[PDB]
């Protein structure tokens, strides 16, 4: 066979140890998921410094906690925009999931609160900036550097999916680089606990699996499709289904035809054809062998999965660090007021937040 006796035994033991880890991780998650802990704060506990990014509903801002002096990233959501875009349950999903998870590549939530106008989620500040910026600046990553990042996403999805969580918004914009050059996934705006199928049309056009676009009840395999899009974009510099308007993007995704740059290795193309697979009975991450089809693929042969988890692998890139509140790795955005109305808005809709 492909593996000699020793290698086969080692791999088998490693895969069993993953099962043991995940069983314990699930116990820990459910304890927090069922009886969540208080993490309250209020707006005047923080100094607002700079807008780090924008989204729907508001911004992410660098803030400074007045008492401790610690810097944080504060996601602000205007409640009236959330209710109109029927993003109420998604925002509740986001908070509850962030509160309960624990993994080295998932950003850590510190506080959550609300006022008359807004919802607030305060998390660890990740100063190295978005993968997106670094990727656009350099053009494309080498296959070894793309692989280093990809491995972290594979482990992160192995963790999330074991908890019945689907992530649903993988893209370089949502992957921050920390001081050691490792990834922090942020933004859990579309994450959801799903036992089998779910039906909401959501995500980012370039990263949507065909079954989302086709309004089919879909499952966690949409995240493995999105991993294929991410790996392609990291290694090429542009995504596999690339067009000016969402409707044209969707047409390309549903056709399913992928073309690869001539510099892609054969190993990489094979992995990507198996991730960017329209047929769910054939898509890696959705078969009997589960995540092992991905982790044991030739393109990952040089990946030491435990060393990645332990963060003992030398990162390809270490971000410029200029102090705990330095924002040099982020682009500039228009600074808008944080309005807090005298009157409570949408109190009914956000009681459980």
């Amino acid at each position: 066979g492909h593996m000699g006796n020793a290698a086969a035994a080692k791999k088998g033991s490693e895969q069993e140890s993953v099962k043991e880890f995940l069983a314990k991780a699930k116990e820990e998650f459910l304890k927090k998921w069922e009886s969540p802990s208080q993490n309250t704060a209020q707006l005047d506990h923080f100094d607002r410094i700079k807008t780090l990014g924008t989204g729907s509903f508001g911004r992410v801002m660098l803030v400074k906690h007045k008492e401790t002096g610690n810097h944080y990233a504060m996601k602000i959501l205007d409640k009236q925009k959330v209710v109109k875009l029927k993003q109420i349950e998604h925002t509740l999903n986001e908070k509850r999931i962030l509160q309960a998870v624990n993994f080295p590549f998932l950003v850590k939530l510190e506080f959550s609160f609300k006022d008359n106008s807004n919802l607030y989620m305060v998390m660890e500040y990740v100063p190295g900036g978005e993968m997106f910026s670094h990727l656009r600046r350099i053009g494309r990553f080498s296959e070894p550097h793309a692989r280093f990042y990809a491995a972290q996403i594979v482990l992160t999805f192995e963790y999330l999916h074991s908890l019945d969580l689907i992530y649903r918004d993988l893209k370089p914009e949502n992957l921050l680089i920390d001081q050691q050059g490792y990834i922090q996934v942020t933004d859990f705006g579309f994450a959801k606990r799903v036992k089998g199928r779910t039906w909401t049309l959501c995500g980012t056009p370039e990263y949507l699996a065909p079954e989302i676009i086709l309004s089919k009840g879909y499952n966690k395999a949409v995240d493995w499709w999105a991993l294929g899009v991410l790996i392609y974009e990291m290694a090429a510099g542009y995504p596999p289904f690339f067009a000016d308007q969402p409707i044209q993007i969707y047409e390309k995704i549903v056709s399913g035809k992928v073309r690869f740059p001539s510099h892609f290795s054969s190993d990489l193309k094979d992995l990507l054809r198996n991730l960017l697979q329209v047929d769910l009975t054939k898509r890696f991450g959705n078969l009997k062998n589960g995540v092992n089809d991905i982790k044991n693929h030739k393109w990952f042969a040089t990946t030491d999965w435990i060393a990645i988890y332990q963060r003992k692998v030398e990162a390809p890139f270490i971000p410029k660090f200029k102090g705990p509140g330095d924002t040099s790795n982020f682009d500039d955005y228009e600074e808008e007021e944080i309005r807090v109305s005298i009157n409570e808005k949408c109190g009914k809709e956000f009681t459980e937040f």
């Binding site: 989204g55 875009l85 993003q87 997106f132 918004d169 049309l201 995500g203 980012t204 067009a243 000016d244």
Partner: peptide
């Protein structure tokens, strides 16, 4: 010739 979105991409909440 290829053409597509190079800037940050916003999520969609419906299609």
């Amino acid at each position: 010739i290829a053409a597509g979105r190079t800037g940050r991409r916003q999520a969609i909440h419906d299609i």
